[PDB]
């Protein structure tokens, strides 16, 4: 029972986690607290992100409420979350259940955390946004600037070392592997703009204010420095069509 | 340097740690608790790994007991010792055996994965995924529990190492940080199979269900095809060059 | 109002007072980390101990150790002040001085390494290795305590930086994340790069072996240098080639 | 501006704590998190009790939600809380502000914690009630059995060592000092029944299923073993009119 | 189904399985504390270490220390089993055996003291004092490690119990909270009460000095005994007097 | 027994703690951190008190700095030493000076109150109340910050000690656990004033604004009237008897 078959994402996740809780008594109270006691997927996400990023400095209850108010202020974030989960199930062979990336894929956590961060930054809570950016970098190994604008349908697989700068913009239905850099090169627009459908391979660098066309493919380890036409595969250092 | 290439690994480690404990009073109770109070190397490893990966969610006592019950698989301890010896052999920055045991996160990631693999094969999949995620957070190393790892492994520096579900590694292999043993929507074998003796340089990507031959040499390269034994491949994309 | 227009410490205190007044969630944190301190170095010791403290190593003890270290070599504080200024110069994402001080893990990794180097030279090797491992865990940055780093350093984003035992870095250098200053061989001795003043290294660049990198050279992103590089040369490719 | 003068309890507490937060920068984020960010007194109470009684075993977020749902299920508990605060302001010379016992009087915390405990016990959550009873005993030094029934207007001053058994019942507007025992003497009714208005002195023992009349006064250190008529002062070991 | 109608351990495991199934908030806690263990003594060591552990003293280390202690003197476990049965006998509020095991701080204080006494006799005096202080903080109960306690003990409610260095308690005794088994004088030696089998002491009763309390005596609540008490006598008052 | 009645308190404490640290490896890093790494007794006291009373809300580093800045009042350290000597004099269970310093919660409650009193007089009332509540939770001792305490105090066992806002205690006093120095709606002086040399037995209640004379002796008694000097009072209610 999946979305490319039948469907309720939330109900399916609850059934999966109920099975898991019954199977592993070591984690049951965790799964009841993180998931089963909640009434919406967004509440679960806020709770788990607060567990990940909480500190003595930033109480987990306070961060939980902040993420809850954020998700309730911006309804589109929950839509993006659900889209990303569906994308991970579609594209990742290692994903056999929906709760799997929800609970255990640090790239998914980094992306959704950034979404909330972006919401806080736009509201003027810049200091808190920087605090959470630093904490996301520490715990997830992923540095996304709060100003970065990311679309829906994103899968950040493995994730370790992903960087996205202040002025980066990503379209919808994009797949990024670990080690990828969407880096800069004086302020202003200076970070990549990635189009819908693009797939970026592991340890690929995309530098500067350059456009990457729809359904382009950036090979693993490549270094892109100029714009890339849509539907082109570029490979090499520097990358070439 | 009374070492294995000049012997009791466990006794040597205990002597090193006794010296350290006497020297640094800030860490002595730590070294007594992690090492000196234990009767076997495997118990020390379980204790330290649980210290690293423990959380409020997962009590350190429970994780310690789980790792000891796992260590059921006596051969894992053998692999641990092998890996330690390899690190002493191959790493110039390793002058003592307790050094990687306590402070090298690549060694910790590899041994943690070994225990994880044991838990996964026994059907404790949820805990295996939980611990995989925690290994990724604390060590910066993502090894899928299904991955099959041989003995004599050295993962130096480690930050960013990835190994997918279907990856298989032989014996006496040396991997640097940033290395990717990655895949290429459809399941099945899709992660590299690395042969005994191979050396992979930093930030090297090996993608897909491809075989890497005995004593091959792969820094920064991107392999997409199989590699014959005893070949040095370099470049993006990789090409034989030696 | 910046250093190119000045007291770094006073400016940082003003910025942090503004932030504390703005965010009530973080006010006590900013008062404890910054406003209650009398010197920038004390703030640095406090924040680093907050980052790297553990149940094994009490934060009060690590704080005192970092304080005694900074007092042992006053010049370390100078380097700290240099590095902050460098980031303000070179990083477009840096609009305030307390920003990297509090939230840039590369800056924290560099200063932590400085203190580590001080402890290692004093013979506190076990603690140096402990803190190296902890820096690797929390920051994702592996710098060997023996590594020699000059002033004016910016380690942007930082995740995955590695620098071995015999690495030496000059002054006014800019390094991005994923960069490797790595070694070669099983035999000890000089085997890690020596980077000259002014060099810029792009993301995920590997520099391997006991090789010299000349003044104001530029190592392109993703490049792999295995030979020495003349001064004022841009090298690109795998392996890197002059251009 | 007090209740025996003018009045909004909640607004007054918020003003007091805003003053405190502005005065002590060491505690400001605490006072914003415990009080100023909340919309009702009951939410503040749930939060602070969760801070007190939270553990690694029992996450503070989970306990916070449990106390919130409890207070929302039983509206009378909040009324009792407000009554108790007013009683402490009335009767305790050391209470010059309303937020003072709210945040810093462990007897007040023990009483309100017990109220929530009683709610959980009546709902059948007996194991959780026992867990929280043990934790209240550890942190507050106060052992109140979850089944005990306590009225409103209670002040438990200093509190250390207060004990109240399974079948104890306390009326309204009662004042109890530290060390007081409402103890037993085979099951069944075996714990005191205390009437409205009674004042019990420090280290006084009241043992058995005995009635204590309205507006009685039990002297400090006394040991009561028989019923006490209303409006009588009893003192001694054993206590005598 | 109780011990007066039997396996204590099996009954406790059944009770805790029921509780775990009933309360999902506490299931992993009950599995870790009880169900994953193979003996009651292991459960006791685990729970006591949970109570008394700290950042200074790792819970794994304290757990191992309590385990080794219990293994050093198997008879301690017998006393534990005795005490639990006593509470079930004597406490109306006890309807299950795991109830005092998990939630009665007097039971925890008594068993903690037993292990403490074992460590003290073995010469681990510094740790014994550490754990005495920690027991005093968490349980509100001060028992000197040298104190000698028999089996069949019920310390109900417990808050404020004190027993000095030279105190000795027989078997099958019932003590309420606030009770003092205290000393007198600045000179060491025997100076703390010796209580005989069967005695019942009421809440906030003080028994001071090196005085013997006879078999099956009853010390009324709030009483202050300063002289020896004959067996099978009820004493009441301040100071206590026969009745 | 090289002691003060047979001298350097600080050096003796350091020697005792060095012996203990060498003997118990489980606590050595603790004893080095709490005591041996410090240069003065007052710093040790600030460190240990912050360890006891620290929380996630109140960082131990901040509380440590606050206690050191308080200790501004040099005389407090004198009182600390006096109290320690008293405990050695009067308590048979005290054979070493570091014993109450590290493990006697009555000593900790008294010294914590001293610092609290200093903070309260300086106007840091909110923090004083916070720390009073924490002292009540951790030590089971409720001392109002306004309470005025003399030197040479021994609070043995301590659990349940209460001292109200207007209480005043002289010098060289011995108090057992459960003792109440309580009050009796209207503010003003309403808590006992205890004279030098007095001894109060366990679970004794002294209520109201009443004077207790020099070298008076009060276990379980309830005093409601003033007590002349050099009188033993016993009973509920209390009566002179010796």
Author numbering:
A (entry chain B), D (entry chain B): 3 to 8, 11 to 189, 192 to 247
B (entry chain C), F (entry chain C): 2 to 7, 11 to 75, 77 to 189, 191 to 224, 226 to 249
C (entry chain A), E (entry chain A): 3 to 7, 11 to 248
From the study:
SAT synthesizes O-acetylserine from substrates l-serine and acetyl coenzyme A and is a key enzyme for regulating cellular cysteine levels by feedback inhibition of l-cysteine, and its involvement in the cysteine synthase complex.
A trimer is present in the asymmetric unit but a hexamer can be generated using the crystallographic two-fold axis. There was density to support placement of substrate l-serine in two of the three active sites, with the third having weak density, where serine interacts with conserved active site residues. The model has an R and free R of 0.234 and 0.267, respectively. There are no major conformational differences between the l-malate and l-serine bound structures (RMSD 0.236 Å), where the main differences are due to the presence of open tail conformations in NgSAT. This difference is likely due to l-serine being a natural substrate of the enzyme, whereas l-malate is not.
